[PDB]
Structure formats: structure tokens, C-alpha cells
Input
Amino acid sequence: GEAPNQALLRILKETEFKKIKVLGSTVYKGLWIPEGEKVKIPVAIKELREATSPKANKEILDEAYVMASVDNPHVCRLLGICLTSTVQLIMQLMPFGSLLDYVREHKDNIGSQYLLNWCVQIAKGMNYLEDRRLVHRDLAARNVLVKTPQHVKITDFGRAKLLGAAAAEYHAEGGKVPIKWMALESILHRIYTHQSDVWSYGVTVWELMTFGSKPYDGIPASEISSILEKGERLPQPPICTIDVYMIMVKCWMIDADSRPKFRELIIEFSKMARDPQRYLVIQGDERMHLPDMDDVVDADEYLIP
Ligand SMILES: */C=C/C(=O)Nc1cc2ccccn2n1
Output
């Protein structure tokens, strides 16, 4: 017996927005003018290419279902869909792209305050998903986006699943899967919970603290289940005090109920964010700084009743 989902799905006319340029391959940087509102909202437009794959259309509409039903500052905002030949998702533009690409590009300019605040913001995002009984199943530094260096959001709800009325764990049957981020119980038994999401939070934090290194780089995915069974885990990043690493390591416990809760991760990373140089040791951390448009509003200041 579940709460009804009264999220609004907004259908947009193709004339309400203009593609300005291409970001990925498709995803476009563009501008959205809501019908007679005198606002310009910078948007990312995810447009299906194939469009004659019925399967592809079920996939994109699940993303849209999930993104319509989440409203949190640390989770990507869907603004609407457009039902042209090619189905278009209109989202808040996240100008600095993925946090994975951002920490690789800016290894040299990123202080402890930013890393730990990112750890908090993704924990807030994930705790909110948990409140909404939602399991992400694909948390990774690639699936967190940068609105500003101060503000990130969890994205890619492609794999996200809601637990049922009494559905504690979730059960799936195949596809291309991100082994190197998955909980042991997920790889062996396709078991997914908020606690399997905490495993992946652990790996996501290891990616940030190693400025975007590949987890278990040059190890085959077939080997990963055995290595974890053997009790091997990702190594302590150079910048990490034992306090930060010990938190990552608890997210990688075999007993899923022994892992921290997202709410606890918010707390531990906040405590550490209050005194960042005590918890991460970075060369020259002390000298680190990062960042008609008249009716432009960020989507975060564009609210619908
Ligand atoms: C979280 C919504 C979203 O997809 N926004 C987004 C995607 C993307 C790709 C590349 C550069 C900027 N981007 N913003």
C-alpha cells in the first residue's frame, strides 16, 4: 500500500526551445522559453537518434518517469518531455559536465573543501532517493553532474528502480552492468538495496579522492567477484587520511546492514568538511579556487506549482 505519485509530467512544444550546440553522441546545450513566461532556462536536451527502436522509447520514458518524481537540490531536475518523431528529454543544463570529467580536468585546482562538500552533496542526494524508496543502481562519478564547482547533482536514472510495497531487495535479469561499482550481493545474486547504493557511493568517493582513477584498473570484470570474496578492496588514496578511507571501507563490508546509512555519511562528511585539511592532505590545498541573457533564470529558480 503505497503513496500515490502526483508528480507532473510537463509536455513541451518543440518551438518552446532552441538547440544552441551539441554536447554528446545525442545531447544538446539549448535554451527553453516556457509558453508566455518571459524567462530563458539553460537546458540539456537528450534526443533519441534511433526512435524506431520501441525498446529504446520504453527506456527513455522510464528515465523521464523517475526524474519527474524527484525534487531535491542534489538530484537532476527534469523540466519536461517533447513528443516529436524523436522523443526529447529537457533537463536543467549542468554546464561543467560530469564530476568524473571535472576532477580529471582539474586534478591540480581542487582542494579538500570541494571534495568533502561533494561527498556531502551526493550523500544528501542519495539519502533523498532513499526517503523516496528509490534505488539508483548506477551511482558513479560519471553519473554526478556539476551545476557549479560548489553544487553537484546525481544523474542517470536509466537503471533506477523503486522497491515494491514490501520489496526490500530488487531482482533484475541481464544487460551491460557496471561491475566495478556494484555491491557483492548485486554481482552474485542481482540483489540491489539502498545499502548496495552505499557500496557504489564508496567507489564514487574513491574516484573523487584519486582525481578520477579507474577502479581496479586493468582487472577483468570476471575477476571482481572473486577478489571481493577474497576480501580485497580498492586501495587508500594518497590524499586520504585513514578517517576518510575507513568510511569508504565500511561502505564495502559484505554485511550490507554493516555499511553506513546515507544519513550517517552526510553527518561524517559534514564533520570532516568543517575542518577539511585535517581529513584530506593535498599539495598547495591552501591556494585553491574555482568558479540576450537578460531573462535567463537557472532551472533551480524556476518553480512550477
Ligand atoms: C542532469 C541533467 C542533465 O543531463 N544535464 C546535463 C547533461 C549534460 C551533458 C554534458 C554537458 C552538460 N550536461 N548537462
Q: What stands out?
A: The longest strand covers residues 17-24. The helical segments are 54-68, 99-105, 112-131, 184-189, 194-209, 221-229, 242-250, 262-273. The domain at 99-286 is CATH 1.10.510.10 (Transferase(Phosphotransferase); domain 1). The longest helix spans residues 112-131.
